[PDB]
Amino acid sequence: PVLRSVNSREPSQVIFCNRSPRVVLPVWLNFDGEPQPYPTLPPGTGRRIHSYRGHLWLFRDAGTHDGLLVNQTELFVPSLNVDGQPIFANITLPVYTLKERCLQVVRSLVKPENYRRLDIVRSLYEDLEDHPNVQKDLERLTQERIAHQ
Amino acid sequence: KVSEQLKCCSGILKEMFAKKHAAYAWPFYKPVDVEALGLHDYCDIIKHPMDMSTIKSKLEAREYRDAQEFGADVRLMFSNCYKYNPPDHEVVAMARKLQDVFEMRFAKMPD
Amino acid sequence: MMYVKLISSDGHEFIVKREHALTSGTIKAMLSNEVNFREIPSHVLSKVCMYFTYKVRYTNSSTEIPEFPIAPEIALELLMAANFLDC
Amino acid sequence: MDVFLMIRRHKTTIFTDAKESSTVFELKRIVEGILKRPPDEQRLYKDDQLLDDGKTLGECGFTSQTARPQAPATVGLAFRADDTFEALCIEPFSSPPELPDVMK
C-alpha cells in the first residue's frame, strides 16, 4: 500500500512521551503497511526508542482504541539525527467533539450487546457500534494523501 | 615501544570511527541502549558490556597498560555481539565487516 | 463581547459569549440574541455550556489538554443533546 | 493565571473567565454590562462569604486549579431593591434520572 515504513536500516533515536491521561499503545506500520502493536506507555511516562528513518507510527488508547495525536498531528515519521540529538514525539489528547466524547463514555459503561436496549434515537445505535478503528483511519489518511497529489 | 603501540591503537580506533566505515560501524559507537532496543535479557546474558566510545575514554585516560589489553576490549565488543544474537542477524554481519578492518591494522602494527 | 441567552426546559437562563455558542452548528444556523430549548433540562444544558468554554480554550492550544469529564448518570442525555446540537 | 466562573442568581447563570489578580469590583463590571445593574446594587459571594470590592479573586480563594473551563467555580449574586439587599438564593439545577439497568 501507500502508507508504509521504508526499509532504510538507518538509525533514528526517538523519545516517546505520553502527556495524555490515557494508557497509550504505539502502533508501527510495517514494510507491507500492516499495523504492528508495541508495548504500552502509562500516562505521564516517557522512554528512549530506537527506530529508523522513514518509519511510520501512530498512537491510540490501549483499552478503547480512541485515536490520539503526536506532535499536533496523526502520523509520526522520524528524521535522521543531528549531532546525536534525540527526536521528540509528544503524545496528547485531541479536542474531541462533545458527541464523540459522549460516545466514548457510554461505550465504557455498556456492553455491546446492550447498545440497542438503550432508550435513545435509532441513528445513535449505528454511531455507537462504529468503534474507533486503525484500518478505518488508514483509508482516510491514504485518500487525503492522494487528493494532496 | 609500549607508548608507540598505544598511539597506533588510537590511530586504529580513529579509523574505526571514520565515515569510510560508517555503514557497518554505527551500532558500536556507543554503549548498548537496552531500553530503546527493548532487550529485557541483555544484561542477563552479557555480563561485561563494551563499545567504541568506552574504549576511546580508556585510551585517553591511559587505562590500558599495553596493546593487548586494548585488543581484548575490542574483541570483547565483538564477542558480546556474536554471543547475544543469532548467526544471520544484520548486526552480526556488520560486526564481521568491522572486525576485519580491526584485525588487519592490529596485525600490521609494528611490535 | 456579544452574549446570547440559552434557556432550558425548566426555565433556567444561561448567558454565554456568542462566539462560544457558535461551536454548535444547530445554534449557528438559528442565530444568523435569545434561544429556547423546550426539551433539554438545566443539568444537561449547563454541562453543554462548559463544553463550549473547554473547546474554545483548548483548540489551537500547544499546552497539553485535560480530559472532559462526564458523570455516568448524565451521559445518555448529554449524547442526545450533543447529536441534536451538532457539536 | 486564568480562572473560569459561573456567576449565579435565582435562575440566571453567567459563564465568564477572569484572572486571579482581577478584583471583585471588576467582576461586578462584567455583571453590570450584561444585566444592567451597577456595582453598588450588587453583592457577590463565595459560598456564604460576602466578598469585598477591593480584594482579588485569588485572595478570596478562587484558584486556576479549582476553577477550570470544564468545571468552573460558582460565585453567588444578590441585588438590592428599595435600599435593602435581598437574601442570597440560587435555584438548583434539575436532577439526573435513575441509572438504567444495563448501565449499572
Ligand SMILES: Cc1ncsc1-c1ccc(CNC(=O)[C@@H]2C[C@@H](O)CN2C(=O)[C@@H](NC(=O)COCCOCCOCCNC(=O)C[C@@H]2N=C(c3ccc(Cl)cc3)c3c(sc(C)c3C)-n3c(C)nnc32)C(C)(C)C)cc1
Ligand atoms: C519498550 C517500548 N515501549 C513502547 S515502544 C517500545 C519499544 C520500542 C522500540 C523497540 C525496539 N525497536 C524496534 O523494534 C524498531 C522500532 C521500529 O522502527 C521497527 N523496529 C525494528 O527493529 C525493525 N527492524 C528494522 O527495521 C531493522 O531490522 C533488522 C532486524 O533486527 C532488529 C533487532 O533484532 C531484534 C532484537 N535484537 C537487537 O536489538 C540486537 C541489537 N541490534 C542492533 C542492530 C539492529 C539492527 C541493525 Cl540494521 C543494526 C544493529 C543494535 C545493536 S547496538 C545498536 C545501536 C543497534 C541498532 N546491537 C548490538 C551491538 N548487539 N545487538 C544489537 C523490525 C520490526 C524489523 C524488528 C522495542 C520496544
